[PDB]
Design a protein around this ligand. Sequence first.
Ligand SMILES: CO[C@H]1O[C@H](CO)[C@@H](O)[C@H](O)[C@@H]1O
Ligand SMILES: CO[C@H]1O[C@H](CO)[C@@H](O)[C@H](O)[C@@H]1O
Ligand SMILES: [Ca+2]
Ligand SMILES: [Ca+2]
Ligand SMILES: [Ca+2]
Ligand SMILES: [Ca+2]
Ligand SMILES: [Cl-]
Lengths: 111, 112
Amino acid sequence: KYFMSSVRRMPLNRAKALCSELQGTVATPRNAEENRAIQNVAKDVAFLGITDQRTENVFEDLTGNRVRYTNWNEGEPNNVGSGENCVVLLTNGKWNDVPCSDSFLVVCEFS
Amino acid sequence: KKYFMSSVRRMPLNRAKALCSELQGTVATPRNAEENRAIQNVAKDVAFLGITDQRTENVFEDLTGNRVRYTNWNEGEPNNVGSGENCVVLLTNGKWNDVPCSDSFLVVCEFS
Ligand SMILES: CO[C@H]1O[C@H](CO)[C@@H](O)[C@H](O)[C@@H]1O
Ligand SMILES: CO[C@H]1O[C@H](CO)[C@@H](O)[C@H](O)[C@@H]1O
Ligand SMILES: [Ca+2]
Ligand SMILES: [Ca+2]
Ligand SMILES: [Ca+2]
Ligand SMILES: [Ca+2]
Ligand SMILES: [Cl-]
């Protein structure tokens, strides 16, 4: 896997479109090593290819596969506000669930 | 090492540049036959390369204004037809053709 970060912020739909344009997908860390690599390429908070849109509190990657490795920040995921179904990697490498409509950088993953 | 990725949609040069730079890459510029073939492997159809003679006609430079050495022009190219052809594309046989920068083609981005 190769990981690349965008320079501009955008919501999830636009983030998925960007990675897909170059035939990749929004980055999904499968272990601590990949999590660190994605954190490093990202200069600020960035979207990961994980959501619980299909079923609340059931986090899966963009292909529908349930995720095993997770690295939630303390108190997360909390689905606050009117709901948070997308996931971002914080600048400390931990994860926070956020609204898919909000804008963040995007880290794309390619094989 | 360099990694090459191809776009799905066709777009003119300005948009090709914008796409690759969005992910901090550049439009693919083969520096030898190995790279040219690596770009061929990912490009399913005619695709833009990061080379132009926009500064001085017939003097081909990469997008950073650095004169290129390796070239793989198709027979008869570059020919600068019509109102001018200052951009370069990789044909499906791996040879190059100069084309209008405003015309749309797939884009291959380069990262390292
Ligand atoms: C956040 O919701 C969007 O993204 C998820 C994950 O790709 C899809 O399941 C859903 O249909 C929407 O397109
Ligand atoms: C007629 O113009 C087209 O074909 C010639 C080759 O025949 C190319 O040089 C040119 O860039 C165009 O693709
Ligand atoms: Ca949720
Ligand atoms: Ca949250
Ligand atoms: Ca020309
Ligand atoms: Ca030509
Ligand atoms: Cl949401």
